[PDB]
Design a protein around this motif. Structure first.
Motif, PDB file in Angstrom:
ATOM      1  N   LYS C  12       0.851  -1.207   0.000  1.00  0.00           N
ATOM      2  CA  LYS C  12       0.000   0.000   0.000  1.00  0.00           C
ATOM      3  C   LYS C  12       0.876   1.242   0.000  1.00  0.00           C
ATOM      4  O   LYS C  12       0.857   2.025  -0.950  1.00  0.00           O
ATOM      5  CB  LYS C  12      -0.921   0.054   1.232  1.00  0.00           C
ATOM      6  N   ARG C  15       2.230   0.905  -3.693  1.00  0.00           N
ATOM      7  CA  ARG C  15       1.375   1.163  -4.844  1.00  0.00           C
ATOM      8  C   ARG C  15       0.779   2.564  -4.724  1.00  0.00           C
ATOM      9  O   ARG C  15       0.100   3.046  -5.633  1.00  0.00           O
ATOM     10  CB  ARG C  15       0.262   0.106  -4.913  1.00  0.00           C
ATOM     11  N   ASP C  16       1.050   3.213  -3.594  1.00  0.00           N
ATOM     12  CA  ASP C  16       0.551   4.556  -3.339  1.00  0.00           C
ATOM     13  C   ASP C  16       1.607   5.650  -3.469  1.00  0.00           C
ATOM     14  O   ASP C  16       1.371   6.661  -4.128  1.00  0.00           O
ATOM     15  CB  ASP C  16      -0.068   4.641  -1.942  1.00  0.00           C
ATOM     16  N   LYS C  17       2.766   5.460  -2.843  1.00  0.00           N
ATOM     17  CA  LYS C  17       3.826   6.473  -2.893  1.00  0.00           C
ATOM     18  C   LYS C  17       4.712   6.444  -4.152  1.00  0.00           C
ATOM     19  O   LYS C  17       5.687   7.194  -4.250  1.00  0.00           O
ATOM     20  CB  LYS C  17       4.691   6.392  -1.609  1.00  0.00           C
ATOM     21  N   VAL C  19       4.444   7.177  -7.979  1.00  0.00           N
ATOM     22  CA  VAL C  19       3.738   7.661  -9.163  1.00  0.00           C
ATOM     23  C   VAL C  19       4.641   8.456 -10.093  1.00  0.00           C
ATOM     24  O   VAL C  19       5.521   9.189  -9.640  1.00  0.00           O
ATOM     25  CB  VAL C  19       2.543   8.560  -8.788  1.00  0.00           C
ATOM     26  N   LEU C  65      16.100  -6.224  -8.202  1.00  0.00           N
ATOM     27  CA  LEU C  65      15.838  -5.191  -7.202  1.00  0.00           C
ATOM     28  C   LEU C  65      15.203  -3.953  -7.811  1.00  0.00           C
ATOM     29  O   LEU C  65      14.421  -4.044  -8.750  1.00  0.00           O
ATOM     30  CB  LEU C  65      17.143  -4.799  -6.530  1.00  0.00           C
ATOM     31  N   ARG C  82       5.257  -2.018 -11.153  1.00  0.00           N
ATOM     32  CA  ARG C  82       3.882  -2.476 -10.999  1.00  0.00           C
ATOM     33  C   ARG C  82       3.760  -3.932 -11.426  1.00  0.00           C
ATOM     34  O   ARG C  82       3.027  -4.702 -10.809  1.00  0.00           O
ATOM     35  CB  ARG C  82       2.922  -1.608 -11.830  1.00  0.00           C
ATOM     36  N   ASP C  86       2.110  -6.733  -8.893  1.00  0.00           N
ATOM     37  CA  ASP C  86       0.930  -7.516  -9.246  1.00  0.00           C
ATOM     38  C   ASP C  86       1.092  -9.026  -9.088  1.00  0.00           C
ATOM     39  O   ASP C  86       0.145  -9.772  -9.332  1.00  0.00           O
ATOM     40  CB  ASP C  86       0.465  -7.200 -10.678  1.00  0.00           C
ATOM     41  N   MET C 394      -6.328  -3.716   3.011  1.00  0.00           N
ATOM     42  CA  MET C 394      -5.416  -2.593   2.827  1.00  0.00           C
ATOM     43  C   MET C 394      -5.080  -2.554   1.352  1.00  0.00           C
ATOM     44  O   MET C 394      -4.639  -1.536   0.842  1.00  0.00           O
ATOM     45  CB  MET C 394      -4.098  -2.801   3.608  1.00  0.00           C
ATOM     46  N   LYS C 397     -10.229  -4.606  -1.814  1.00  0.00           N
ATOM     47  CA  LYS C 397     -11.529  -4.327  -1.219  1.00  0.00           C
ATOM     48  C   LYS C 397     -12.557  -4.824  -2.183  1.00  0.00           C
ATOM     49  O   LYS C 397     -12.357  -4.621  -3.413  1.00  0.00           O
ATOM     50  CB  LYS C 397     -11.729  -2.833  -0.920  1.00  0.00           C
TER      51      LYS C 397
END
Ligand SMILES: [Zn+2]
Lengths: 397, 98, 397, 397, 397, 133
Positions: C12, C15-17, C19, C65, C82, C86, C394, C397
């Protein structure tokens, strides 16, 4: 806490292995451990008491070490030592007692006193040692979270309960049917009575049942089961259920028929015994169910026939019963039993120092009240308090 | 970890002639140093080296990590680059002794 | 276990911080942590599933890495990342689910699956971090031994119970007196009725009482208490206690007299409120006792007098009631409530994969059945299973 | 004050990001902050408690720092740390609680306790950080001055009020007209009744109106408005306005006609809805006005016609109603709601420690009394006290 | 867009972590990110407004940086910073609001304003960071496309609908049979009535059914199902289907018989519950079907028998009902619920600035109208608009 | 048999005398005894179970000895140890139980299990001690 423990096996394995004689070498591994302590202490200051009729005492430290020199031990060596131990003895006592009274709802588990809150400190941890004392052995394993366990003779799992249930009754109480019992400590006695001697009952048999729910699971229980309830085998005048009058019970005893004892765990039968009297094993259970019947004798000599008429008045009351005693068992939770002095120690220290009733324990540490509502908080406090009592008994009895 | 570094340090600062530095001082000096961040620059690089560290070491021509003993007539393997050889990029199933 | 947690806040907070753009230094402390993982993994094979309709997907590891070089991340950097996340996503899912079904009577609190039993391994603990997710925060403190605690809203403490008790009744059911109620979730509604409107009652007052015993203690509860039980304010045709016939209830509502609510803990009154409607606080309790009375109106206008004759038939049935709702509270044990999706997540995963009924949980994870017999085993399994559901939410959903 | 905050996110973001394993790199920016604290502290002595039944524990400090060495945490590192945190935990608790009871009329918005008055000191400020906890975020903005704001579910804006107003009545109470309502928490139910079914009313329509004045403005409110007041749809026997007798209410419900809800702010209509049931938004208001009518049905089937005669006795009482619930809203002032535990925490700590009634808050922190006379002093004290409760809940629940 | 997000967590994680005190270290990774922004900005002129009552403030950019030449932040450092943030605050507000009104049919899922159309520009992407705000987390996942999702307490899935269906009726409306209901928000109440009490019905049982089709699928729903529909348990005078007259409903309630709730997805039963009241889980469904029956009581006491004659007039109307409430659920599409302020924020900003009705949203952002015809365009616009509202609430409440 | 005994007082006088705090020297005579064991073990493999509802788990060995880091033990020392004891615990249990069921008329006074018949072996006797139970 674990700290506390050491402080003792330190002294016992001390006031015991140190006397006019013996060679040094059998204590070398011991002397050392000891000194280590003294150091950590000296300089640090303490305070105990200040609650109810409990003396407030302050203590300081500043002591010599030990002659790691000599080969043998000369009398003079002892005395100069005993004099230094007797300050730790008279100390620890005043320490145990201080944390053996304070209770707390939230964290009823952890330490309370200004004496101990300072012991759990890190700089003192430099002292743990030999934890073969059944109780500490179990305290630790409980922190790491794992299957603990204790040993008890005639345990105290049943809150006192002495009552009856009339399944058939009428105002005159001249033709009753029901059960009466006494659950107390490690024993259960229950009787089923039928004034009519099953004269109009299907198959001339009246079924009875007594269920007892333990507040904690008992495992590895050795149990004595015997037919008859001597306690309910004699004439009695009893108060009615509503307290408005008194009834007469005039028992005559017959053998309990189709006896079946079930030791259940979460509703499941773990052990079942059919008419087996003597010694039986119940390996894991939270409930005991005793089922037994009164069967009207199909053949009766005149003397017997005379006791059981076809019509009232019913003057001899047919009664069947059972007696069950848990001799020993293991419980994952601390309990009072017939051999350990823990409950008595805690209760006694509180009584002697006029300790006020607190928020956790029932007035007077009443066992029945405690076990009846054995909440997690009461158990955590009880275990803390029992473990301290056991640490204290290593030195002071 | 002790002196070594400290010595060079002070020297490059010029100003003082080490030596006459009470031993309580030099060490105490470390005690304070060993409690600070690190010029992102400096730091950012070490993180880099560590991540690849492993890779270099085994990736060398002269030197490899330990050997295993089976006392079990064992089958030799075959790998294009070495031919008929006895390697094994995976030690699992036998104690390890640093 | 704690292991598992990280694996997520990892992703989380990942995949959030990450971009297209962000200046590196917002993640330096992050990238690192990440890689560390990859290493520990690669080389170890894993297995999941193996029951009902749960596929048996196999997994392997061998990944590059993450160049910690660049100063500003270029799109190309993301995608090559990504694609590696996944596999962990689609993985963890298959991991949670696998240990979100297995149950154990004995140590039903620890790990079970061939997937997790390998995670608690030591060589893996090189990962733990950022345990701020309310649930893990509480998992640890429990494994460590201390006052845990969770936050709720319209909690689900009352197993569904809708019934009545006739204190005075007769075959025709034309002059009854008793109570009827609905306990469900966080709400209680109870009505006391007296067909005779206390015509022959001492002081023309009929006393009522409703006691509800919680299976777990609730602390810091914010509660709404209102007079009247709307649910029992309308005409009803009800089945008799023995199911042999039906009776008629035709209520007319009066204000409950001498209302007293007691929140007790182990038999002790912790909070008591006398006729206080609106918002009240109950700080620590395992039992709620609602006492209220019906007092025959001493003065009645003709229209009122007409409803309450001196003799039967009694056609308008005097009724008084109360409504109590626990808006929020804290519990030391996990519970279902009106906001959290844990119970629904666990129940849903089991239903979707046709997971067979096990030895711990009631069929369908039925809440009423679960809370009615909330054994230690069910609670430990529920907590394990709820904590995993929260770890899963987290990311998925 | 702000000081206090840090002390926590310090520990949480601590007792959370520190476990057997994790890389140092996830805490470098953290460790630092931590130490900084320790320094500022040790050397200074503290006193907490006194008032009421609250222990007075004295606290000293002098704890060694940490290590920046190991770049991979070893178990041993944790324990030597947790032992140092558990003194700050058990501390802060005793700190929050101490300033969570003292109230002050004059300047009862700032610090009071001998514990905190020393914290606002300057030499301490060297700590403050990570103010992302919704409550502190708002404390600050209030210090400087700016549009603050909080978020609430089923807010508690309406002091409990359950009453009626008879616009037309007579001794026999056989032909009444008026309204009855229940305002409580976030809900309003109001019914308008006319025993005559507007038989002699202009246009055979009786107008009703219910006005509710909020003690604080609510903004961004999501509201459910539904026709009918179920609470006032059943037969009742009610006390007369003067308490001298009782009247009979026998409702029959009709749809409310010409429903108009106005959300006003300082007398101005901000939002108005005409007969719109379901979900509506009221963006800024301090008053709600509900207007609705009972219109005698112009066409009636026989069964209906029979309920509404041209002459008394009027036995079926025509009733129209509305139900309004504020699901969520924002308020510039702290309030109790259905999800937050603040009020319950403050009320609970005061109750547990037998804190005497003070000069600011109503006995028992009674919500209805508090919101009814929500003075500036009560609000400033409430906010201080709620903010402290929120700081405490980050560590102790 | 994603751009926008950062601009905030930038400020929050800023106006929060930057205060008189703290060690630099806490913000090193932060300060940086910040500056980066300033640069990209300075020099670009921005315009906001130009519609309804929306000012047209223009903004220029020429701001200094943030020295990194310090350890402990001195007050002076803060103020020289807060003054620079307060231009970004008062800015963003004026930015959100501007794009929180414009709507577009074709590409409604995209940006509109002259303010934002310039933000999606490439030269700005250099900012984006810390995307953990539940909403953005979901915005992203939606553009690459996958299993998106949200969390709602008492969601708002049912457009308001309050009506009835007479399956048997006649002009006099003296012997009706049918159902009446209220679907609103997260709740459904439905009653089935039969004036004849199934006197001539096969097996003396009348079947009822209520079907509700959701406009969006709900997954992981925790639902409360209770017998009885209190809303339809009282006497009513209702308008006839054709509006020409009014009928009388005088209910008497019986328990619903053979209750069966089905949660279907695309016509398939996903979950089915037979007579299970209390808490149930519906894991994935787009339709709810409630089937229940009225069974004439086979045995009736005189009082009951009197209500149900063999011939008309039928004066007591047998009624059975159900109440279903969705406490929580997950939806792949944004929805209004009882806790989130999104709908209220969007609706409020539009109302305050007198924004004209556009081509996408119903007048007043009416929820019922919106959810009734929840087209793809309305959903894309709603999501864009809800995500912006959530970005705004991080700074301005 | 006597073998078996030791294996325990070994662990008890172990899981008890080994705590985060005591000085090394209070266990010198102990540590030793311990290690000695580990050695004798590692390698030889064991079978337990094979009857009624008794699981048949296979136990194999592979453990490093014990450090000594002077001046009282550091927490880190404990954990790396407890983790090695918990294999012996969960082991012995499965060992006792296995020979606590088999019976034999003729010579049912001696070892029966494939687990114990191997313990009475000679190469193991090198352990026995503190027989005060
Ligand atoms: Zn709610």
């Amino acid at each position: 806490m674990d700290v506390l423990y050491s402080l003792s096996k330190t002294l016992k394995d001390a006031r015991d292995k140190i006397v006019e004689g013996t060679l040094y070498s059998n204590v070398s591994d011991l002397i050392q451990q000891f000194n280590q302590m003294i150091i950590t202490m000296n300089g640090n200051e303490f305070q105990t008491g200040g609650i109810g009729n409990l003396p407030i005492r302050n203590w300081n430290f500043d002591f010599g070490l030990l002659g790691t020199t000599l080969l043998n031990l000369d009398a003079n060596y002892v005395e100069t030592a005993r004099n230094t131990i007797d300050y730790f003895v008279d100390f620890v006592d005043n320490v145990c007692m201080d944390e053996m009274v304070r209770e707390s709802q939230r964290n009823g588990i952890a330490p309370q006193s200004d004496s101990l809150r300072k012991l759990s400190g890190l700089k003192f941890k430099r002292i743990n040692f030999d934890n073969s004392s059944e109780y500490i052995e179990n305290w630790n394993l409980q922190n790491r979270r794992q299957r603990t366990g204790f040993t008890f003779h005639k345990p105290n799992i049943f809150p006192y309960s002495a009552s009856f249930t009339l399944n058939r009754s009428q105002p005159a109480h001249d033709n009753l049917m029901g059960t009466m019992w006494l659950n107390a400590g490690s024993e259960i006695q229950v009787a089923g009575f039928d004034y009519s001697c099953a004269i109009n009952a299907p198959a001339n048999t009246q079924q009875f049942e007594h269920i007892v729910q333990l507040r904690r699971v008992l495992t590895t229980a050795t149990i004595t089961l015997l037919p008859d309830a001597e306690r309910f085998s004699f004439p009695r005048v009893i108060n009615s259920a509503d307290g408005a009058t008194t009834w007469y019970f005039n028992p005559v005893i017959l053998r309990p028929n189709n006896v079946e004892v079930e030791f259940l765990l979460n509703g499941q039968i773990i052990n079942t015994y059919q008419a087996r009297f003597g010694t039986i094993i119940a390996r894991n259970f939270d409930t005991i169910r005793l089922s037994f019947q009164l069967m009207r004798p199909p053949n009766m000599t005149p003397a017997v026939a005379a006791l059981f008429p076809n019509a009232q008045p019913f003057e001899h009351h047919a009664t069947v019963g059972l007696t069950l005693r848990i001799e020993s068992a293991v419980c994952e939770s601390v309990l009072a039993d017939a051999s350990e002095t823990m409950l008595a120690n805690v209760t006694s220290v509180r009584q002697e120092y006029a300790i006020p009733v607190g928020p956790v324990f029932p007035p007077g540490m009443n066992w029945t009240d405690l076990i009846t509502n054995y909440s997690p908080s009461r158990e955590d406090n009880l275990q803390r308090v029992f473990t301290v009592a056991s640490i204290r008994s290593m030195l002071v009895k | 970890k002790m002196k070594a570094i400290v010595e060079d340090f002070l020297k490059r600062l010029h100003i003082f002639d080490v030596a006459r530095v009470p031993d309580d001082q030099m060490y105490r000096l470390r005690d304070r140093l060993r409690l600070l961040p690190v010029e992102v620059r400096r730091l950012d690089i070490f993180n880099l080296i560590l991540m690849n560290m492993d890779q270099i070491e085994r990736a060398s021509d002269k030197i490899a990590q330990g050997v295993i003993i089976a006392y079990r007539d064992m089958q030799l393997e075959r790998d294009e680059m070495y031919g008929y050889v006895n390697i094994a990029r995976n030690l699992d199933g036998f104690q390890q002794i640093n």
